[PDB]
Design a protein around this ligand. Sequence first.
Ligand SMILES: Nc1nc2ccccc2c(=O)[nH]1
Ligand SMILES: Nc1nc2ccccc2c(=O)[nH]1
Ligand SMILES: [Zn+2]
Ligand SMILES: [Zn+2]
Lengths: 366, 366
Amino acid sequence: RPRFSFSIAAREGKARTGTIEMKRGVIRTPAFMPVGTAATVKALKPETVRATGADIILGNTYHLMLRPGAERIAKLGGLHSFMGWDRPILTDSGGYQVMSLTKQSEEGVTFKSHSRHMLSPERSIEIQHLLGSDIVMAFDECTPYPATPSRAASSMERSMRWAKRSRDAFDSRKEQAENAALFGIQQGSVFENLRQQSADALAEIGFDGYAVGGLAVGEGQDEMFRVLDFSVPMLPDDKPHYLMGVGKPDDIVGAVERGIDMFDCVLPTRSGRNGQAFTWDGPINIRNARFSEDLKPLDSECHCAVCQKWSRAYIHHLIRAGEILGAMLMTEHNIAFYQQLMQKIRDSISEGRFSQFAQDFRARYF
Amino acid sequence: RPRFSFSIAAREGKARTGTIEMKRGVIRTPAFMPVGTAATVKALKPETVRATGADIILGNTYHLMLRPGAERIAKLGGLHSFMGWDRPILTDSGGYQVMSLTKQSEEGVTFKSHSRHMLSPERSIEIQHLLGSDIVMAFDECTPYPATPSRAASSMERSMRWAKRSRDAFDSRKEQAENAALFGIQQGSVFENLRQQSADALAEIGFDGYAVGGLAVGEGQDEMFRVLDFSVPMLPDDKPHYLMGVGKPDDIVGAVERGIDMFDCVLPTRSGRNGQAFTWDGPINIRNARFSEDLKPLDSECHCAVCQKWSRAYIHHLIRAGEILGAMLMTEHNIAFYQQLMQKIRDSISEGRFSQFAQDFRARYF
Ligand SMILES: Nc1nc2ccccc2c(=O)[nH]1
Ligand SMILES: Nc1nc2ccccc2c(=O)[nH]1
Ligand SMILES: [Zn+2]
Ligand SMILES: [Zn+2]
């Protein structure tokens, strides 16, 4: 088990399928990472998360640095033993969440805990180290949407300076540099020239993987794909491409077609508790009266435990009754559905029939 | 597998240990029945409930007749397939919940859904049949606490008339009378003569088991035990004795010492989500700051999955963060703890050392 090794086993167009080997395990790509906000993938035990097929989960730094605190989790042995997940864990830098859920300067960002806090590239990298993150994300400044070329450039340029600092901060910490990986984050809003600048600077600094940031800011899928079309090719081909905050089945398939290898999004979990269930025939709102006496499983083909044991009628009842089990069952199904999606994606690419799979997927889902 | 067969395998004082054989399974007594309010044991999958050691669960008729409706559940195949629990299920008559969570008459009770509804002995028995209940409880009128001798007598006498009606309603339904069992409920508040009257009337009508009702109404454990001391002996010795709504470790041990064979209470589940965890050293509130960095499991001896994988510090974090997993883990532990309690009880009685076990239990728990 090497610190980090990305191998591409097959391609079709811009799409790629392969593996990322790390000390804590192998990550099959394209990969979908279930999101674990506060040291938990909402409503699911780690074993359940793994059982659905996930090889890696995403840990939210923002919430953890606040509660229960990075230093504390390190004192308890790290995020891995703390939450009972022994496989790889990717941690975001926290800057994003801060700018969403404040005084900003070239040194970093200061904010009030919804207490006062300072978060810089150095502190971000240290927090992720304290948590014991396997894939560390560089600390960046997200660019609001819409953004003017000038503003986008300033932010992108600041992010690149911050990327260099993240890099050095990471390399300066022996244990971290030797057991974990560092991903740089491309910015530049929807402007091609900025994206190119960011890509080259990122490549110039050198990272283990490259993320495409600033694309989950309210733009439509059409604009996102347009941006991906010219952005992903700018990134080093032999390293993973990670589309941050992007999920939603059809979004994922389109991004893979454009070269993305990694995904994360709260939709599976959040929508689940909200009553939305993903199926190959598109999403459905289980709370709708039409499911009150529907004995069929959430999805007719899904092989997840939920679809094997319970009906839509029962889950319909639980969600409308505000029952915790409803949240558990919906979330397990959705995450299982997402992993199943990724598996079909990896298989179709390995078999040189991903294009057909994508077409067939869209035809039925919509 | 007979319809109903209670066998006592061992005794020590008033305590008894044995089994109740029913079509859907064997129930080891003394037994604790996890409570499933709205067709679910809050925060737990049926397999998990079973894994903790439960042989039977209690289904709340009240909530089910309202949502999703008895007729509907019968249409979907019954409570068993609806919730994924194929073992025995005991259903309360619903009258209690109505008088708690309204126009009362000799024919029954009318109430407003917190819609208008009528619930009589006949309707109660039919609802439980529609749900597919294995152990049907007679429809009774609970006696408020405190209650005067006159009022207690009127209510007890009405309950006895209602017990006869429940009996006939049950026997008049072929499929139900042949596959399920019927338990009568003793009333009479804290008055010995009324309890005796109720017991004889109940015995006169004849039931498969006898419950001691009206004892979870705010009286202290001292008064409850006093009542149990003279009440339980009045009930037929060769049939199960069920103390309704009574849980809380020390309450259970004391009631077994006084001849009770069956228990149910929401404390395990409700307290769990509230942050209270039961241990052999007494209950603890996991939210307390003293557990923020406690790496030990909820309880040092518990063999439940939660205590094998997660620390008090993690569960402390989840509960304070309002995380669903916290509710899941706390509830699994508590129910597992309750089942472990019952096992130690059954074993000590089988081994003629229940008295010592009770003494040792109290010494440490308190
Ligand atoms: N740090 C960071 N995190 C993100 C998460 C989702 C979408 C976008 C981003 C982004 O641009 N930067
Ligand atoms: N039907 C019924 N249910 C109960 C539940 C808990 C305690 C007491 C009672 C009782 O007396 N009757
Ligand atoms: Zn499913
Ligand atoms: Zn435990």
